[PDB]
Amino acid sequence: PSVFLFPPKPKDTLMISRTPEVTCVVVDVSHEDPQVKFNWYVDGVQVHNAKTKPREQQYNSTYRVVSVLTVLHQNWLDGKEYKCKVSNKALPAPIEKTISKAKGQPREPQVYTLPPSREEMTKNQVSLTCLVKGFYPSDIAVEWESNGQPENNYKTTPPVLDSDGSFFLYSKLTVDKSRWQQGNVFSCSVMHEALHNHYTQKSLSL
Amino acid sequence: PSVFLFPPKPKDTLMISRTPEVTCVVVDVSHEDPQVKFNWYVDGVQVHNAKTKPREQQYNSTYRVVSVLTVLHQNWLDGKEYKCKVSNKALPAPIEKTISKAKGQPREPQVYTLPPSREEMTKNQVSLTCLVKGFYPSDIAVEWESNGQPENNYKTTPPVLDSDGSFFLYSKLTVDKSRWQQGNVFSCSVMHEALHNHYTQKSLSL
Numbered sequence: 238p239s240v241f242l243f244p245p246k247p248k249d250t251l252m253i254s255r256t257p258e259v260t261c262v263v264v265d266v267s268h269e270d271p272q273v274k275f276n277w278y279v280d281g282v283q284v285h286n287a288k289t290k291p292r293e294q295q296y297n298s299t300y301r302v303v304s305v306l307t308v309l310h311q312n313w314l315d316g317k318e319y320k321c322k323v324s325n326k327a328l329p330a331p332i333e334k335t336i337s338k339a340k341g342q343p344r345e346p347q348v349y350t351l352p353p354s355r356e357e358m359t360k361n362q363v364s365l366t367c368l369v370k371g372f373y374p375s376d377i378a379v380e381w382e383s384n385g386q387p388e389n390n391y392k393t394t395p396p397v398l399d400s401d402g403s404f405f406l407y408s409k410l411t412v413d414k415s416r417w418q419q420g421n422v423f424s425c426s427v428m429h430e431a432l433h434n435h436y437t438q439k440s441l442s443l
Numbered sequence: 444p445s446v447f448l449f450p451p452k453p454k455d456t457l458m459i460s461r462t463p464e465v466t467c468v469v470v471d472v473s474h475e476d477p478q479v480k481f482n483w484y485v486d487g488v489q490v491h492n493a494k495t496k497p498r499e500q501q502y503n504s505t506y507r508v509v510s511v512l513t514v515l516h517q518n519w520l521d522g523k524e525y526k527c528k529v530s531n532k533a534l535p536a537p538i539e540k541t542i543s544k545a546k547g548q549p550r551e552p553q554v555y556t557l558p559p560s561r562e563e564m565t566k567n568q569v570s571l572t573c574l575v576k577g578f579y580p581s582d583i584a585v586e587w588e589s590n591g592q593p594e595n596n597y598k599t600t601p602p603v604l605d606s607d608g609s610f611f612l613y614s615k616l617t618v619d620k621s622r623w624q625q626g627n628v629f630s631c632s633v634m635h636e637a638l639h640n641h642y643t644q645k646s647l648s649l
């Protein structure tokens with residue numbers, strides 16, 4: 238039997254508008270004694286209930302059980318600790334797994350937008366690059382936009398640990414050299430802990 | 444018993460000046476019957492010898508054995524297949540693991556150098572960004588330089604799979620806003636399969 242505990246989605250914890258949850262999963266649960274008890278403690282105090290919810294699932298020749306605890310945005314950011322205590326009769330003692338947002342002195346990220354290279358103009362499409370760096374923790378999110386709709390073609394690299402214990406990352410928005418020379422403006426959006434409203438925007442235009 | 448087979452170092456396979464090797468490792472080797480036989484086959488034909496070399500190692504309460512086959516640069520790039528056949532008397536049948544450079548139609552990467560943002564000038568240091576994209580396979584390498592010495596402060600992100608099955612990546616060289624305004628020139632170096640000499644260089648300067 239194994240118990241995997243999962244953290245909320247970065248973007249959920251950063252917008253009060255959303256809902257962030259912590260997912261506790263259990264695998265290899267005796268096909269014989271499938272009964273399973275879950276315990277949830279925030280910082281140390283059980284919330285067993287706290288609108289916590291699961292449901293059985295027969296798999297392998299074994300069973301799988303998911304439990305989901307809804308978290309409070311400020312609770313998560315203010316670094317509360319969450320614990321999942323799974324107990325089963327076909328198990329010696331129960332298993333406990335804890336989790337909490339990445340600990341550490343927060344750093345406000347610096348967002349830089351860079352136009353395409355003077356050389357990439359040869360090509361039909363061009364790259365709009367967003368340099369985001371100096372942030373901590375890693376939990377971050379970046380999206381592009383041209384107006385009341387989000388640009389579709391763009392990939393963002395994962396966070397890379399820099400030399401100053403801080404992370405950086407680039408996001409690259411592919412756009413038809415046309416839309417770019419025409420004059421349109423694109424925006425690099427960033428939702429991070431250390432931002433004023435956990436949010437910020439940087440513009441880009443011919 | 445487990446057998447892990449490792450590929451050469453990207454940068455070794457790209458410079459005839461270097462030496463590339465394939466490393467076969469074995470773990471959990473009966474502390475009782477430690478005798479171990481290794482077989483190496485290139486494309487299918489054994490090279491057992493081919494200047495292949497190993498040496499015992501007592502660990503855990505078990506044993507660990509490393510074997511190293513030297514490879515031919517063109518052999519590796521031209522996609523030859525390498526197989527490691529480890530046999531032991533305390534094992535039913537022997538174990539075989541094979542490996543070969545990442546298969547697939549090669550793509551010449553496009554290298555773009557971008558100066559720091561008009562906004563990052565506020566800061567004491569600045570970022571020189573090298574956009575490398577459109578390459579395949581991932582096996583790649585990027586280094587910075589200012590003259591007869593390689594710049595020390597710079598991190599490169601891992602390869603990110605784009606929307607066109609091709610990879611891209613950014614490299615960021617931190618430099619004192621001084622050295623940059625003074626007039627120095629920095630160079631983004633790239634060693635990739637699909638490059639003329641598996642190499643190319645792009646410059647950057649005020």
Ligand SMILES: *[C@@H]1O[C@H](CO[C@@H]2O[C@@H](C)[C@@H](O)[C@@H](O)[C@@H]2O)[C@@H](O[C@H]2O[C@H](CO)[C@@H](O[C@@H]3O[C@H](CO[C@@H]4O[C@H](CO)[C@@H](O)[C@H](O)[C@@H]4O[C@@H]4O[C@H](CO)[C@@H](O)[C@H](O)[C@H]4NC(C)=O)[C@@H](O)[C@H](O)[C@@H]3O)[C@H](O)[C@H]2NC(C)=O)[C@H](O)[C@H]1NC(C)=O
Binds near residue numbers: 239241263264296297
């Ligand atoms: C017995 O069978 C199990 C199921 O395997 C099945 O076999 C295949 C052929 C199909 O028939 C499928 O039905 C199924 O794959 C064997 O695998 C199980 O155990 C392994 C580890 O031993 C586990 O891998 C771990 O995955 C972790 C990340 O995924 C989370 O873990 C559970 C484990 O069951 C996964 O099912 C979930 O994906 C889970 O992720 C969360 O899922 C919930 C519910 O959907 C979501 O709400 C969350 O958002 C999501 N969180 C995330 C990922 O953000 C990983 O961290 C860890 O390192 C392992 O890699 C398999 O996931 C699990 N099988 C599955 C996919 O159900 C099992 O090994 C067999 N028995 C033995 C011999 O162990």
Ligand SMILES: *[C@@H]1O[C@H](CO[C@@H]2O[C@@H](C)[C@@H](O)[C@@H](O)[C@@H]2O)[C@@H](O[C@H]2O[C@H](CO)[C@@H](O[C@@H]3O[C@H](CO[C@@H]4O[C@H](CO)[C@@H](O)[C@H](O)[C@@H]4O[C@@H]4O[C@H](CO)[C@@H](O)[C@H](O)[C@H]4NC(C)=O)[C@@H](O)[C@H](O)[C@@H]3O)[C@H](O)[C@H]2NC(C)=O)[C@H](O)[C@H]1NC(C)=O
Binds near residue numbers: 469471502507
């Ligand atoms: C019994 O003990 C083993 C050793 O553990 C020891 O315990 C600690 C407390 C210390 O006392 C140390 O002495 C040592 O860590 C247990 O671990 C061993 O097995 C695991 C997997 O079960 C293995 O992890 C795998 O690592 C892979 C990558 O590393 C390669 O694999 C071997 C495995 O032994 C490693 O030793 C090497 O790092 C190897 O990498 C290559 O190494 C050679 C030789 O140095 C180099 O020439 C190559 O350049 C290098 N190639 C690379 C990495 O590019 C990984 O792919 C895989 O997914 C696993 O994660 C451990 O590495 C191995 N222990 C070590 C580090 O020696 C073992 O599990 C115990 N028995 C049991 C119950 O399995």
